[PDB]
């Protein structure tokens, strides 16, 4: 019974780590696109100036 | 490791001897030898006691073999009964490999002659620095008052 | 007696941060103490015999 | 890391099997893919210079 | 059988036959049979 | 006593096999537990080289089957020695009983 | 913050595998299994630092912390997205006006 | 795909070694049981030789 409980909590923490990894990758991609757009918004300022 | 005890008639105060012995057993020929290591101030001729030979365990003519050797067992060779008390580290891993549990180890008895010949230690343990000078320098002007 | 002792020892070698009591550690303690106490019953019966 | 920890095995259990050769194939495959990516990167840099 | 130790099996059956020979020797009556040399104390 | 010694030697060989099989289990479980993103994953200096001490799968299988074969052989020999010893005891008991009865008569 | 939470989760994961391995191997033993020896008074020595309730509470607190952090990550991602679309619309409209 | 194939080969290796460990454990069980019966018979021989 003891080893069954330990295996159950191992399964739970594995699933938790997996979804955390996916969320971190998604926000990293969103941050990369945000920085790309921030670098791209310089041109209308230059053509106006 | 081994030793064997001899009575001594004419000795002044000691009543027995203990002679430390290392017993070797050569595997390639099943030949056994007995050597006593040298002690400094013992007057006995010390060194090889038994030449490398095949020693007979029986009056029929059977020789010693490595299965009969263990700890804590008397071994009789040429009218002398050696008491094996300890084994080498290479022997200890060898006998369990062949299928023999070695006996639990014991201690080697000491020769009373050489134990009395040990010189005393020239040493002394230093005294503590808590004197009438040290007490006066730390507990001055401190008294305890008790009503009674 | 020997198997209970070696199981209890190698499971009290458990990690650093997570050493956990349960219903089974007390079971092992009770078993070892019980066998150690009840070998004396057989030794006393041997003396009587 | 897998090769390093499979090296630390007992004397008789050092067994050359399907997994070991698969690891040795995977390492060379990864190195070849990295080299292909590097040469494509160099071509992209030169073409950026042409666009400029 | 494939899993036979022939040397040890021959040793054990020769020991049994020699035991029976020693038994016949110590249950002899006329003294005709010989003595087995192995079953002797040194 | 000699047969007991041989059985103990076979037991020692089996124990020596098990104590390395467990280390194999631990190493292979560490191997299978790895993933892409875990702490303490590092390059090895001068990797992808096969050690000279490596053996083959056929030799490993032969070693395991040989050890099992030897242990089963020793078990069978000890069993038929047990039967032999039982018969020796029966012989001696019956012989002594018959002799005592004859002497009393 | 996500990297710190991932590090804590991975450490708890590794401790979980070590505990599972010790528990399973000590369970697998029988009477004649190897490694047996004399006792050094290990019966009275108890060095347990946790109870099952505290252990489950520790693991559940880690799980709930990671879940709340995931929710914060999702709302931050949505805020970045709507910021981006709003700014693009503003730029396009002002360029047309000029 | 290479990572998945490596994992499958490692799983097969683990299964093989587990099976052989189980067989060796069963053989050890039978051998030690026969050994204890041999010591029982040796003690019976000792008591017979003593009472003779």
Nearest 5°: phi and psi at G46? -125, 125
Closest CA–CA distance from residue D46 to any residue of chain F (Å): 32
Please state, in angstroms and rounded to a whole number, the distance separating the CA atoms of residues H1 and D2: 17
Determine the Cα angle at A13 with ends A11 and A15, to 5°: 70
- Chain-chain contact of C11 with G46 (C-beta, under 8 angstroms): no
Asked if F88 and E3 come within 8 Å (Cβ–Cβ), the reply is no
Distance CA A12, CA A15 (A): 5
Question: Is B127 exposed, middle or buried (CB count within 10 Å of its CB: 0-12, 13-18, 19+)?
Answer: exposed
Give the chain A residue nearest G56 (alpha carbons).
Answer: A9
Can you tell me the distance from the alpha carbon of B18 to that of B107, in angstroms, rounded to the nearest whole number?
Answer: 13
Query: How would you write B91-129 as a 3-class SS string?
Result: HHHHHHHHCCCCCCCCCCCCCHHHHHCCCCCCCCCCCCC
Q: How many CB atoms lie within 10 A of CB G50?
A: 15
Which chains, if any, share at least 3 CB pairs under 8 A with chain G?
Answer: A, C, F, H
- CB burial class (10 A; 0-12, 13-18, 19+) of residue B95? middle
Pairs from C14-17 (Cβ < 8 Å, separation ≥ 24): C14/G19, C14/G22, C14/G23, C15/G15, C15/G18, C15/G19, C15/G22, C16/G15, C17/G15, C17/G49, C17/G50
Strand partners, B17: B6
Let me know if B21 is exposed, middle or buried by CB neighbors in 10 A (0-12, 13-18, 19+): buried
The set of residues, in sequence order, having a beta carbon less than 8 Å from that of G91 and lying 6+ positions away, is A41, A44
The alpha-helical segments, DSSP class H, found in B5-111 are 89-98
Report the residue count for chain C: 49
Sheet containing B48-53, strands listed edge to edge, beginning at the edge strand earlier in sequence: B2-7, B16-26, B31-35, B48-53
- DSSP string computed for D1-52: -HHHHHHS--SS--EE-HHHHHHHHHHHHHHHHHHHHHHHHHHHHHHHHHH-
**Is E29 near chain F, with CB under 8 Å?**
no
Specify the DSSP element, H or E, that contains H11. Answer: helix H2-51
C interface test, pick of A1, A2, A4, A6 with most C CB neighbours within 10 Å = A2
Query: For residue A13, which of G63, B75, F103 has the smallest C-alpha distance?
Result: G63
Whether G30 and chain H come into contact, CB under 8 Å, resolves to yes
Cα(E35)–Cα(E13) distance, rounded to whole angstroms?
A: 19
E strands in B8-100: 16-26, 31-35, 48-53, 74-77, 80-83
> How far apart, in whole angstroms, are the C-alpha atoms of residue A18 and residue G63?
12
CB contact under 8 A, E5 and F80: no
Assess contact for H9 and F31: CB atoms under 8 A: no
Interacting residues of E15 by C-beta distance below 8 A, sequence separation 6+? F84
CA angle G36, G38, G43 (to 5 degrees): 100
Is D8 an interface residue toward F (CB < 8 Å)?
Answer: yes
Q: Is residue F54 less than 8 Å (CB to CB) from chain G? A: no
Q: Is residue B81 within 8 Å of B74, Cβ to Cβ?
A: yes
The answer to whether E10 touches F78, Cβ cutoff 8 Å, is no
Q: What is the DSSP letter of B64?
A: P
Residue E6, both tokens:
């022939």
The two most distant CA atoms of chain H are separated, in Å, by 78
Interface test with A, best of G3, G9, G25 (most A CBs within 10 A): G9
Q: Using a CB-CB distance cutoff of 8 angstroms, which residues of chain E are in contact with residue B58?
A: 42
Can you give the length of chain H in residues?
52
Facing residue for F39 by CB, picked from G10, G17, G21: G10
The token pair that represents C12 in the structure block? 């009290």
Q: Which helix (H) or strand (E) holds H9?
A: helix H2-51
The closest of B81, B71, B68 to B34, measured between CA atoms, is B81
Rounded to a whole number of angstroms, the CA Rg of chain C reads: 15
Q: Tell me the resolution in Å.
A: 3.6
> For tokens 């020239």, what's the residue?
B122
Pairing type for strands B74-77 and B80-83 reads: antiparallel
Distance in Å from the first CA to the final CA of chain C: 24
Residue B63 has phi, psi (to 5 degrees) of -100, 165
Q: Which of H39, A1, G62 is nearest to C25 (CA)?
A: A1
- Can you state the percent helix, strand and coil of chain E, rounding each to 5? 50, 0, 50
Say whether A3 and G10 touch across the interface (CB within 8 A). no
Optimal mutation site among F68, F69, F86, interface H, most CBs of chain H within 10 A: F68
Chains D and G touch (3+ CB pairs under 8 A): no
Q: Which of B93, B91, B59, B56 is nearest to B77 (CA)?
A: B56
What is the three-class DSSP state of B20?
strand
Burial group, residue B34, by CB count within 10 angstroms (0-12, 13-18, 19+): buried
**Which single residue is written with the structure tokens 């001490």?**
F53
| Backbone phi, psi, residue D9, to 5° | -135, 160
- The CA-CA-CA angle for residues G24, G28, G32, to 5°, reads 150
Query: Distance (Å, rounded) from C-alpha F53 to C-alpha H37?
Result: 40
CA distance F41 to C33: 45
- Chain G positions touching F22 (Cβ under 8 A) are 25
The kind and range of the H/E element at B3 are: strand B2-7
Distance between CA atoms of F17 and F21, rounded to whole angstroms? 6
CA distance linking residue D4 with residue D27, whole number of Å: 13
Going by beta carbons, is chain E in contact with chain H, meaning 3 or more pairs sit under 8 Å apart? no
Question: DSSP letter at B32?
Answer: E
Q: Are C8 and C29 in contact (CB under 8 A)?
A: yes
- Residue C25 CA, distance from chain mean position: 9
Helix (H) or strand (E) holding F33: none
- Experimental method for this entry? cryo-EM
Query: How many CB atoms within 10 Å of residue F100?
Result: 10
Query: How far is residue G28's CA from residue C6's CA, in Å, rounded to a whole number?
Result: 12
Q: Please give the backbone phi and psi of residue B75, each rounded to the nearest 5 degrees, phi first.
A: -120, 125
| Long-range contact pairs involving B27-31 (C-beta distance under 8 Å, separation at least 24) | B27/B66, B29/B54, B30/B54, B30/B63, B30/B64, B30/B65, B30/B66
> To the nearest 5 percent, what fractions of chain G are helix, strand and coil?
75, 0, 25
- Please state, as a whole number, how many other Cβ atoms lie within 10 Å of the Cβ of residue G24: 13
Search chain D and give the residue with CA nearest F53. D14
Q: Is the dihedral of CA D9, D15, D18, D20 positive or negative?
A: positive
């Amino acid at each position: 019974e003891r080893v069954n409980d330990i295996g159950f909590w191992k399964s739970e923490i594995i699933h938790e780590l997996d979804e955390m990894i996916g969320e971190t990758n998604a926000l990293t991609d969103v941050k990369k696109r945000l920085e790309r757009a921030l670098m791209e918004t310089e041109a209308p300022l230059q053509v106006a100036r | 490791d081994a030793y064997f005890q001899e009575d001594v008639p004419m000795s002044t105060e000691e009543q027995y001897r203990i002679r430390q012995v290392n017993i070797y057993y050569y595997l390639e020929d099943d030949s056994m030898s007995v050597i006593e290591p040298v002690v400094e101030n013992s007057g006995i001729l010390q060194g090889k006691l038994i030449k490398r030979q095949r020693l007979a365990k029986n009056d029929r003519g059977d020789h010693y073999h490595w299965k009969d050797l263990n700890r804590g067992i008397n071994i009789t060779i040429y009218g002398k009964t050696f008491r094996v008390v300890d084994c080498d580290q290479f022997t200890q891993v060898f006998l369990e490999s062949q299928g023999i549990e070695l006996n639990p180890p014991e201690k080697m008895a000491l020769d009373p002659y050489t134990e009395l010949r040990k010189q005393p230690l020239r040493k002394y343990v230093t005294p503590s620095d808590f004197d009438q000078l040290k007490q006066f320098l730390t507990f001055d002007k401190q008294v305890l008052r008790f009503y009674a | 007696l020997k198997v209970a002792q070696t199981r209890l020892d190698e499971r009290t070698r458990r990690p650093n941060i997570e050493l956990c009591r349960d219903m089974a550690q007390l079971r092992l303690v009770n078993e070892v103490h019980e066998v150690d106490d009840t070998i004396q019953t057989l030794q006393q019966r041997l003396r009587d015999a | 890391t897998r090769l390093e920890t499979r090296t630390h095995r007992p004397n008789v259990e050092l067994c050359r099997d399907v997994a070991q050769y698969r690891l040795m194939k995977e390492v060379q495959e990864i190195t070849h893919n990295v080299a292909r990516l590097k040469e494509t990167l160099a071509q992209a840099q030169a073409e950026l210079k042409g666009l400029h | 059988r494939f899993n036979l130790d022939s040397h040890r099996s021959t040793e054990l059956t020769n020991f049994y036959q020699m035991v029976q020979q020693h038994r016949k020797y110590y249950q002899d009556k006329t003294g005709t049979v010989p003595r087995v040399p192995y079953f002797a104390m040194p | 006593s000699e047969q007991i010694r041989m059985n103990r030697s076979a037991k020692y060989n089996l124990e020596k096999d098990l104590k390395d099989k467990f280390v194999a289990l631990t190493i292979d479980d560490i191997c299978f537990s790895l993933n892409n993103n875990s702490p303490n994953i590092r390059y090895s200096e001068n990797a992808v080289r096969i050690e000279p001490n490596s053996v083959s799968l056929e030799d490993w299988l032969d070693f395991s089957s040989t050890n099992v074969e030897k242990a089963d052989k020793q078990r069978n020999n000890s069993l038929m020695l047990k039967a032999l010893v039982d018969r020796i005891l029966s012989q001696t008991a019956n012989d002594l009983r018959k002799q005592c009865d004859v002497v009393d008569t | 913050a996500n990297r710190a939470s991932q590090h804590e989760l991975e450490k708890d994961l590794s401790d979980k595998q070590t505990a599972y391995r010790i528990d399973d191997k000590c369970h697998h033993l029988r009477n004649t299994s190897d490694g047996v020896g004399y006792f050094r008074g290990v019966e009275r020595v108890d060095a347990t630092v946790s109870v099952p309730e505290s252990w489950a509470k520790f693991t559940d607190d880690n799980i709930l912390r990671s879940q709340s952090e995931r929710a914060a990550s999702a709302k931050l991602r949505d805020d970045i997205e709507n910021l981006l679309v709003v700014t693009a619309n503003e730029m396009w409209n002002q360029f047309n006006k000029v | 795909k290479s990572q998945s194939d490596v994992n499958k080969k490692l799983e097969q290796r683990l299964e093989e070694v587990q099976f052989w460990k189980k067989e060796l454990d069963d053989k050890l069980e039978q051998l030690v049981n026969v050994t204890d019966d041999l010591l029982i018979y040796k003690i019976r021989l000792e008591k017979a030789l003593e009472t003779l």
